Nucleic acid binder design. Structure first.
Lengths: 70, 225, 70, 66, 129, 88, 156, 259
RNA sequence: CGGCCCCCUGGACGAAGACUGACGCUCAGGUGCGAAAGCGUGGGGAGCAAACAGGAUUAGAUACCCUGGUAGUCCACGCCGUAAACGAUGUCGACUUGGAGGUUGUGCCCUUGAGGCGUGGCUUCCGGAGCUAACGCGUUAAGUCGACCGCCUGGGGAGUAC
């Protein structure tokens, strides 16, 4: 996330850019995840758990939308 | 009686998307154009006629017909049709166990009548404003629900339904009571509960109107007979 | 109740009060046994009408279909 | 809308530094195909080629590293 | 591996009835044909039609009465794991004779009742009801 | 695997038509040639168990073919092993 | 003309904040002494009410059975959820050889001669269910003859 | 009989996929939903915001006819894509007509340049334009009467993107997206782009040659976190967004809307 | 089993053809392979970390937390042969309604475009009949059958004792 302030560029705008860059770089998350060793099962476990939630989110909810609430 | 051209013009042949089809409708489907199912009219019309004949038979013996449609697209029309042949109908939400638990709904009808009498023949007015409002609101509520089956009589000898899957609750009740069923069955629906399936476009308004008008006519004919 | 429930389809009541009172009844295919309900446990309700207005030969017929079965 | 499909490339070339660049992040990372519309088959090749390039210093490992 | 074709044939019939299939096709064999003929004789199928020269396909036309299927139950009795042979006196009665038990005799394949009349036992292929 | 040219060379030798490519004799030869070829490979990489699995499969399949040959035609069976020099 | 037998009455509980709320289940069966049979299962706070419900339900959801003069028309197996039931026609006079709940239903059905053992579970509610199921599938010679398209004599 | 077939193809022959044949009769009007029947399976749930013209009020009562669009079927129940797009076809046709005589004659006011090119308006819709077109010469109609209406004379179009530059002035005068993605690039070239779908993190405005904008959620407004883009802008609407970033590599032009 | 490269190498799958011609299935014993830990010899040893030490906490804290930290984790060759070695689902074969995906082939179609129409393999999810104690499974079955094998027979005692 190297950044150079453009000419006549306000400081805050640059800073906001930098945060945007870090988010896109996804650095904080990566540091967080690497902070402690995750047993591979735990990793596999999370990944599969995560996927399942996505699918349930995508589908089961979509079907519900078909029916009105009130 | 109803010509096939007429149905096609209405838009009967059109069905639901393929991915929602119910395989029990495979016999009634003709094909799938543009990723949408097409109802084989050749198999439609004779079935429809057969049903119409059956209804006419029922009307002849002074049968009570019940028209069920709550799509809220075809709610107006079904009410209209039922009145045309002065039959009773349920254009709004089918009360669970309306037929099976008739003895209870019988009470609700009775309440409705009283409210109506109070409103009109009473001419009583001088009723507390908030009380009056509640009565009016209640009366409206019942009318919306049971208006069609207030002057229809009692349990129906036959049951015409505009969308099987949508009205499966009604379908089930009729099957438990054994009342013959005449359902418009779209491709997504399940025809098993139905006695006289009518493979057709439940959804489109014109088609629904087409469906009703024939039914209304044959009923009236049966009555005249 | 079933007829006080518009279930037991009761058309005409061709009966002669003071002697015999035979009447047929149908049902909108609800498998409720119109005559059975009209009779009851060993003519439970049948006895009621039997000694109701006076000793009458009340009878119930399981209406089949149309006038031919009538 | 995979470019490679229209080109129908039998195989992506790591030498094709411009084309890879067309899928390397300004920070130096690898693109999800969602964003490109690249088919997954070609995607795996693209990643492989990008790695190969990285090794020859044709592409950088990260914008920052030096 | 395919170890019992006859059992396979029956199963095809059983499922086909279950799924309300009009007709059921399978690789023909002389034995299968004989059985099919018996079923048609006893009226458990409308008709069977073998077709093909190199590797013929037997095609059965299932029977449905009043909606529900005609062949209520169909079991192998003899089977490669365990063969069953009955003498004319020991021939079974499926459903006390309402059903039929296909039995292979010296004098061709026949229903048990026929075999009893014929007066000779044999290998009991399958029960039908 | 066995190089295309090699296979053809074997096929021509053992197959009668040289197009047949299905003759029991031909298949055995093919397996044998490959088996011998790998012997060099596994001598080097003793721990490559996955590959060795494929080898055994080849061995097993070879054994069955021979056995099939044996009951069907002995003389061919005898002639064949003599050609390949299979102890059994 | 309908006879009614209450098979079993059982007390069942439902735990609530205060304590246990007890209720009763009545399993009853009714028949005409001919084909027509129907079981009823009622539930209520007081036994007499419960049994009355069961009688009430049983009277509906009847079912017909083809009965060779006194007995069944052929050996029949009937299963439901635990109870798997075998029952077999038997010579005149032998009476109803059957156990427990299965006994009662047969009686109202008007079967007078049956040999029937109830394998598997013997929980009243299911076993009666099986018997109904078995009797239900039981087909008469006339029925099959129609089914297969043959005369009865062809079937003998 | 074969009546059904011949008719079946006849009805195939008398209807087309796009919104081309003005066939749908308005059978029901209620704010804020119009609906028609163009001989499809089901009746369209039309917004009222495709069918009010240039001042906000509705224009078409029952019996009026506009085609809508198709090629997307049954998102579960119903049928269409909106007739507003159909009109885009008509605008393209009139624009093409210029070619015939090399002069489309329209009435165009290009007041000011969002992305270096004044925006020129057709009676209903508003477009974004290149810089050179806005005047044939350097007249620079910023000194002209605000929103002067003289004409529309095409200097530049991308011929794929909906970007048309009109010379409103001087009557007398008369793979593919990703190799050369540097036209809207420099820093802040504004664009007029229709939003497609708001994913609860963003809005996905994307109009220029099969590309994708994200504006997601951070700018969108002058409120950062409590915004929920669906509440704040629209669904299916042409907006002010600018590029603010191009990754021609990571093919994610991160547009903005706080500008 | 996961950076990239080369050498040797197994398997799977698709297209058509050509060939052999039942050569198949399963499998007691038997043979092999078999995570992690562990054992041996010899290397290697960053991080991490049983053991251990100390600091905390606590009534205690032989732990959770903190500061360190050796075996091991790594390499070679052997041994060990067990894991919730799990889909808690033996293997092979056939049949029985659908839907939505993923992935990998391949035929045709104006690819007139990312398309259109198929036809295979593997695979994820939902679900029909059916089945099931229910939970659920549901063409990858726990549905419908067939072949063979293994295994079960109350709980503890005990997968322990000899």
């Amino acid at each position: 996330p190297v950044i150079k302030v453009r000419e006549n560029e306000p400081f805050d705008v640059a800073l906001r850019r930098f945060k945007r860059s870090c988010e896109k770089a996804g650095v904080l998350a990566e540091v967080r995840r690497r902070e402690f060793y995750e047993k591979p099962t735990t990793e596999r476990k999370r990944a599969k758990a995560s996927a399942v939630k996505r699918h349930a989110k995508k589908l089961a909810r979509e079907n519900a939308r078909r029916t009105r609430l009130y | 009686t109803v010509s096939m051209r007429d149905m096609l013009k209405a838009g009967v042949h059109f069905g639901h998307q393929t991915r929602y089809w119910n395989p029990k409708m495979k016999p009634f489907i003709f094909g799938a154009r543009n990723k949408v199912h097409i109802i084989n009219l050749e198999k439609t019309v004779p079935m429809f006629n057969e049903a119409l004949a059956e209804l006419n038979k029922i009307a002849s013996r002074k049968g009570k017909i019940l028209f069920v449609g709550t799509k809220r697209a075809a709610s107006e029309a079904v009410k209209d049709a039922a009145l045309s042949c002065d039959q009773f109908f349920v254009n709004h939400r089918w009360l669970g166990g309306m037929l099976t638990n008739w003895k209870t709904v019988r009470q609700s009808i009775k309440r409705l009548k009283d409210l109506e009498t109070q409103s009109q023949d009473g001419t009583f007015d001088k009723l507390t404003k908030k009380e009056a409002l509640m009565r009016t609101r209640e009366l409206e509520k019942l009318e919306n629900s049971l208006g069609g089956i207030k002057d229809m009589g009692g349990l129906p000898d036959a049951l015409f339904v505009i969308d099987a899957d949508h009205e499966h609750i009604a379908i089930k009740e009729a099957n438990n009571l054994g009342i013959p069923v005449f359902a418009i069955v779209d491709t997504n629906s399940d025809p098993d509960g139905v006695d006289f399936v009518i493979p057709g476009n439940d959804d489109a308004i014109r088609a629904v109107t087409l469906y009703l008008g024939a039914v209304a006519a044959t009923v009236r004919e049966g009555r005249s007979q | 109740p079933e007829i006080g429930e518009e279930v037991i389809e009761i058309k005409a009541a061709a009966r002669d009060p003071g002697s015999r009172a035979k009447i047929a009844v149908k049902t909108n295919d609800k498998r409720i046994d119109p005559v059975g309900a009209c009779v009851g446990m060993r003519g439970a309700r049948v006895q009621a009408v039997s000694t109701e207005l006076g000793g009458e030969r009340i009878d119930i017929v399981l209406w089949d279909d149309n006038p031919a079965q009538f | 809308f995979c470019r490679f499909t229209a080109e129908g490339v039998q195989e992506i070339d790591y030498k094709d530094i411009a084309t890879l660049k067309n899928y390397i992040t300004e920070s130096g990372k690898i693109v999800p195909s969602r964003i490109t519309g690249t088919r997954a088959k070609y995607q795996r090749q693209l990643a492989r080629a990008i790695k190969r390039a990285r090794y020859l210093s044709l592409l950088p490992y990260t914008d920052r590293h030096q | 591996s395919m170890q019992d074709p006859i059992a396979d044939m029956l199963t095809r019939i059983r499922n086909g009835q279950a799924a309300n299939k009009a007709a059921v096709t399978m690789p023909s064999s002389k034995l299968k044909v004989a059985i099919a003929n018996v079923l048609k004789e006893e009226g458990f199928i409308e008709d069977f039609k073998v077709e093909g020269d190199t590797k013929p396909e037997l095609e059965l036309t299932l029977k449905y009465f009043q909606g529900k299927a005609v062949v209520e139950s169909i079991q192998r009795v003899s089977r490669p794991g365990l063969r069953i042979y009955k003498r004319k006196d020991e021939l079974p009665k499926v459903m006390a004779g309402l059903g039929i038990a296909v039995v292979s005799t010296s004098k061709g394949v026949m229903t048990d009742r026929a075999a009893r009349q014929a007066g000779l036992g044999g290998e009991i292929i399958c029960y039908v009801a | 695997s066995l190089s295309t040219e090699a296979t053809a060379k074997i096929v021509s030798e053992f197959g009668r038509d040289a197009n047949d490519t299905g003759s029991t004799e031909v298949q055995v030869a093919l397996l044998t040639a490959q088996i011998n070829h790998l012997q060099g490979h596994f001598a080097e990489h003793k721990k490559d168990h996955h590959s060795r699995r494929g080898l055994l499969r080849m061995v097993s399949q070879r054994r069955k073919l021979l056995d099939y040959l044996k009951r069907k035609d002995v003389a061919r069976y005898t002639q064949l092993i003599e050609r390949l020099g299979l102890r059994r | 003309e309908l006879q009614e037998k209450l098979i079993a009455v059982n007390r069942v509980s439902k735990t609530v904040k205060g304590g246990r709320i007890f209720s009763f289940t009545a399993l009853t069966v009714v028949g005409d002494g001919n084909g027509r049979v129907g079981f009823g299962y009622g539930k209520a706070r007081e036994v007499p009410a419960a049994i009355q419900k069961a009688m009430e339900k049983a009277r509906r959801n009847m079912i017909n059975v083809a009965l060779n003069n006194g007995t069944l028309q052929h050996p029949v197996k009937g299963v439901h959820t635990g109870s798997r039931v075998f029952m077999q026609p038997a010579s005149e006079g032998t009476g109803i050889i059957a156990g427990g709940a299965m006994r009662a239903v047969l009686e109202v059905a008007g079967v007078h001669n049956v040999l029937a053992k109830a394998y598997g579970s013997t929980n009243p509610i299911n076993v009666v269910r099986a018997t109904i199921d078995g009797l239900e599938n039981m087909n008469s010679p006339e029925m099959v003859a129609a089914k297969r398209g043959k005369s009865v004599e062809e079937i003998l | 009989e074969s009546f059904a077939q011949l008719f079946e193809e006849s009805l195939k022959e008398i209807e087309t996929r796009p919104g081309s044949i003005v066939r749908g009769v308005v059978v029901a009007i209620d704010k804020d939903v119009v609906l028609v029947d163009a001989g499809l399976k089901s009746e369209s749930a039309i917004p009222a915001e495709q069918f009010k013209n240039a001042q906000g009020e509705l224009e078409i009562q029952v019996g009026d006819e506009v085609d809508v669009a198709l090629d997307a079927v049954e998102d579960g129940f119903g049928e269409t894509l909106l007739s507003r797009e159909k009109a885009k076809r008509h605008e393209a046709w009139i624009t093409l007509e210029k070619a015939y005589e090399d002069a489309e004659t329209v009435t165009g006011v290009i007041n000011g340049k969002v992305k270096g090119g004044f925006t020129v308006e057709l009676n209903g819709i508003r477009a974004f334009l290149p810089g050179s077109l806005v005047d044939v010469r350097p007249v620079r109609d910023t000194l002209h009467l605000e929103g002067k209406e003289l004409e529309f004379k095409v200097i530049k179009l991308d011929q794929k993107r909906n970007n048309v530059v009109v010379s409103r002035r001087a009557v007398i005068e008369s793979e593919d997206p990703w190799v050369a993605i540097a036209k809207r690039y420099p820093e802040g070239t504004k664009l007029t782009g229709r939003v497609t779908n708001l994913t609860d993190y963003g809005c996905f405005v994307e109009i220029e040659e099969g590309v994708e904008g994200l504006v997601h959620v951070s700018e969108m407004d002058w409120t950062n976190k409590n915004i929920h883009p669906s509440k704040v802008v629209n669904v299916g609407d042409v907006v002010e967004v600018m590029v603010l970033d191009i990754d021609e590599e990571r093919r994610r032009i991160s547009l903005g809307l706080k500008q």
